[PDB]
Design a protein around this ligand. Sequence first.
Ligand SMILES: *[C@@H]1O[C@H](CO)[C@@H](O[C@@H]2O[C@H](CO)[C@@H](O)[C@H](O)[C@H]2NC(C)=O)[C@H](O)[C@H]1NC(C)=O
Ligand SMILES: *[C@@H]1O[C@H](CO)[C@@H](O[C@@H]2O[C@H](CO)[C@@H](O)[C@H](O)[C@H]2NC(C)=O)[C@H](O)[C@H]1NC(C)=O
Ligand SMILES: *[C@@H]1O[C@H](CO)[C@@H](O[C@@H]2O[C@H](CO)[C@@H](O)[C@H](O)[C@H]2NC(C)=O)[C@H](O)[C@H]1NC(C)=O
Ligand SMILES: *[C@@H]1O[C@H](CO)[C@@H](O[C@@H]2O[C@H](CO)[C@@H](O)[C@H](O)[C@H]2NC(C)=O)[C@H](O)[C@H]1NC(C)=O
Ligand SMILES: *[C@@H]1O[C@H](CO)[C@@H](O)[C@H](O)[C@H]1NC(C)=O
Ligand SMILES: *[C@@H]1O[C@H](CO)[C@@H](O)[C@H](O)[C@H]1NC(C)=O
Ligand SMILES: *[C@@H]1O[C@H](CO)[C@@H](O)[C@H](O)[C@H]1NC(C)=O
Ligand SMILES: *[C@@H]1O[C@H](CO)[C@@H](O)[C@H](O)[C@H]1NC(C)=O
Lengths: 397, 397
Amino acid sequence: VDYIAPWWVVWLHSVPHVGLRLQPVNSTFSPGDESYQESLLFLGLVAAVCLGLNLIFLVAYLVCACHCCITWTAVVAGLICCAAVGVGFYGNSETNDGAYQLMYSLDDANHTFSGIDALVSGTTQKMKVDLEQHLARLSEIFAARGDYLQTLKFIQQMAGSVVVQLSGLPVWREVTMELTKLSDQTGYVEYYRWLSYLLLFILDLVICLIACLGLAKRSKCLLASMLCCGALSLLLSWASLAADGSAAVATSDFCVAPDTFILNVTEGQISTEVTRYYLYCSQSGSSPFQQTLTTFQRALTTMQIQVAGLLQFAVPLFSTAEEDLLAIQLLLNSSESSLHQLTAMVDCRGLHKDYLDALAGICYDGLQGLLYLGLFSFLAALAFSTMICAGPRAWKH
Amino acid sequence: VDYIAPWWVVWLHSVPHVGLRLQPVNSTFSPGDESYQESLLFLGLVAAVCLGLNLIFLVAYLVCACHCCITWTAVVAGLICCAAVGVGFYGNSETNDGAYQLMYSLDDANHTFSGIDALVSGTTQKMKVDLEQHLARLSEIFAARGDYLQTLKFIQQMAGSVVVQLSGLPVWREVTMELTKLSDQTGYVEYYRWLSYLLLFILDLVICLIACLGLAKRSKCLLASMLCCGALSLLLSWASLAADGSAAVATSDFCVAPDTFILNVTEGQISTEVTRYYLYCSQSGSSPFQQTLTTFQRALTTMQIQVAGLLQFAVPLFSTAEEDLLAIQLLLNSSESSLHQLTAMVDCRGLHKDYLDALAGICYDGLQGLLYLGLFSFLAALAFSTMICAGPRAWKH
Ligand SMILES: *[C@@H]1O[C@H](CO)[C@@H](O[C@@H]2O[C@H](CO)[C@@H](O)[C@H](O)[C@H]2NC(C)=O)[C@H](O)[C@H]1NC(C)=O
Ligand SMILES: *[C@@H]1O[C@H](CO)[C@@H](O[C@@H]2O[C@H](CO)[C@@H](O)[C@H](O)[C@H]2NC(C)=O)[C@H](O)[C@H]1NC(C)=O
Ligand SMILES: *[C@@H]1O[C@H](CO)[C@@H](O[C@@H]2O[C@H](CO)[C@@H](O)[C@H](O)[C@H]2NC(C)=O)[C@H](O)[C@H]1NC(C)=O
Ligand SMILES: *[C@@H]1O[C@H](CO)[C@@H](O[C@@H]2O[C@H](CO)[C@@H](O)[C@H](O)[C@H]2NC(C)=O)[C@H](O)[C@H]1NC(C)=O
Ligand SMILES: *[C@@H]1O[C@H](CO)[C@@H](O)[C@H](O)[C@H]1NC(C)=O
Ligand SMILES: *[C@@H]1O[C@H](CO)[C@@H](O)[C@H](O)[C@H]1NC(C)=O
Ligand SMILES: *[C@@H]1O[C@H](CO)[C@@H](O)[C@H](O)[C@H]1NC(C)=O
Ligand SMILES: *[C@@H]1O[C@H](CO)[C@@H](O)[C@H](O)[C@H]1NC(C)=O
């Protein structure tokens, strides 16, 4: 399963990012860049211009009608509004699902990075402090024994090699903090956006239902209030279309080159080869951690051989401080367990799956949901324009 | 993230399973057992009895009305039907999402098991065939050299140890086939179920819309066909409630003890320690594969030591057919790569995540969707009962 850009992503990416004063920006995902933000603002301003044109057209139509089948038009408008609200519910659910998929992927990546850091730090601190303490305690036990201290200093050098090899592993403390911040911000924004769109759907349904009630019961003050709220809802729906279009364009622009964006943004705290390994994930047997993991496992194996040989030969001679030998053997066993867990976590599979899940959430689900919310906004605008244009005819009966 | 049974699961599991002849049957999940299937059939028969009682009540009410505000009742029935169809859409989407989550989890577990089997088989066949061929070819190269053949036979014994250790790993060929069959069946059943419920929603909405149309236009002939279709839709909705209730009870009974069910069903194909390891993720415990992976890595390290020492020493003397030594070194490098990939894949994390994702799909999403579909069925039955009971009054005006 390798990522491939969907069709709608590459259609939306083809949308000219033209900026404010009609100057073509390069249209490559780069938030913070003035030109890209200006292109998004230009899309928002285009949607606002469409809103202004629609309001002007509605005002002109009402002026012409009031200075110069309607039930069928009202029924058609209500049906179109109901279809729009259904499409909006579908799009809102899809966008929320995509955002939550991204949140889960980020949380899983954060958990894996924190686990890698925890094992690295624990193994290093253990093999330093506890091992040096045990060897120092054994130092006096093996009194006047040249070979039995040569083997202990060999153990010390091998532990130093272990610590040196582990220290060369990437530290994900910064990356965990960035992922936590991104996850919290995504959760906050997604919650507020879903709540706002749910309130918009509820308001739209209430307005349509009360307008139908006023049509049935021939209300006078009720209908005027519903038309005022209809103008307000048309304004709000065009603003929602602006937001949905800008967000969808930005999302498609990012999703065209997600690996490129991730490589560029993570040049600081993550090495290039590690990022390429976790993003493209070649099955060609080339892992940046392979050499250090092999060195660590060889060092652990060697120390186990020396400690086992010492235990086999120290019992006939001393048999006094063998509790320290068993403690060291247990420490090496736990270190090998930590080795297996680490070489499992530093593997591509989990992080590549998390990255692919995040991309699927924010492109296959989030972007489709944004498109459907834009379709909702356009359909609601059309329905409410039809409701307002057929306004005076029902008002004058 | 550890699995915990939700509240609604333990409420639904508390539902008595009393069989057909009112004999209490065990509530533990056992689809193959006859008594459990009889309890599910009893739940279906209870729902059918409720359907029959509702039909009898409707017939009695119509007989009383036809042998002896209505617009408000029709509007209330239409509103309740619309709410029911919305709840049914939500439940259908949720159930489909849960089933697809289960399908994805099963596919991921299948991919991991297939990869483990592929690495094991490839490494075994390589270390047998290619290594024996290279050593046999080197046999004549090191003619009349006892030490350089003792080292080669040592390499042969270490390769045999590698093959023996790898052969002790579980073979997932059977589990792969079972997972493929389960995923295919789940996909087929989910597709057909979603299509059937979508058709039911479409039919219900069409019937309600045409009934509302005939209410205003006073077309009695169409409303007789709509009454017949309403009786049929009430029957179908009660059948759907039967299916949803039985499936929800079965799902809750399974989900109370998913670990127990998985352990009991997978007793011969998979060793019990392996199942416990991948189900209760023993991060603080131990891995059943740790000993064999340690033996395999130690063997690879040893053989690399002998081959490196031989290459360092054989080139100055012979320098003939040393491409075989480089090929053996490349083979050992690829074998260490396969070792790292295997010890990554045989880890607990990936399979435990797949299992937890499957449980979340079929319990947090599938069961909730089934409950909402049952609520849809009950609400649609109530709405159509209200539509039929207010039948003769609108018919006779
Ligand atoms: C991401 O992982 C980090 C681990 O580094 C989590 O941070 C810890 O969170 C626990 C939970 O309250 C705190 O008790 C610790 O003090 C935190 N430690 C550090 C170093 O921050 C973090 O919560 C995780 N975030 C997510 C969203 O999973
Ligand atoms: C550290 O691990 C080793 C190997 O697992 C333990 O040595 C024994 O190894 C044999 C394998 O030939 C096992 O059958 C024994 O069960 C192991 N001993 C025990 C007590 O389990 C070694 O004992 C471990 N270290 C400690 C402190 O227990
Ligand atoms: C589960 O994994 C198995 C691998 O053992 C897949 O089976 C292979 O599928 C490919 C795809 O067409 C075939 O070309 C092979 O002949 C199959 N091999 C065997 C041994 O069956 C299977 O497709 C996977 N299933 C899912 C749902 O992912
Ligand atoms: C198998 O791997 C070893 C170790 O990676 C290769 O030996 C060289 O090891 C040093 C590390 O001290 C690397 O810097 C060299 O790049 C390695 N050599 C090469 C050619 O890359 C050994 O060469 C590998 N086997 C083969 C056939 O290339
Ligand atoms: C956009 O930027 C990329 C990278 O900086 C560059 O390769 C590309 O040529 C730019 N586009 C244009 C039209 O110059
Ligand atoms: C990242 O993108 C910016 C803007 O296109 C560019 O200036 C910079 O060189 C890029 N970084 C890398 C490492 O290519
Ligand atoms: C159901 O079976 C389990 C195990 O076979 C048993 O422990 C339990 O008591 C049984 N249920 C009843 C009600 O006896
Ligand atoms: C599996 O469940 C059946 C039915 O409850 C029981 O008879 C059997 O002993 C169980 N298997 C195991 C291994 O417990």
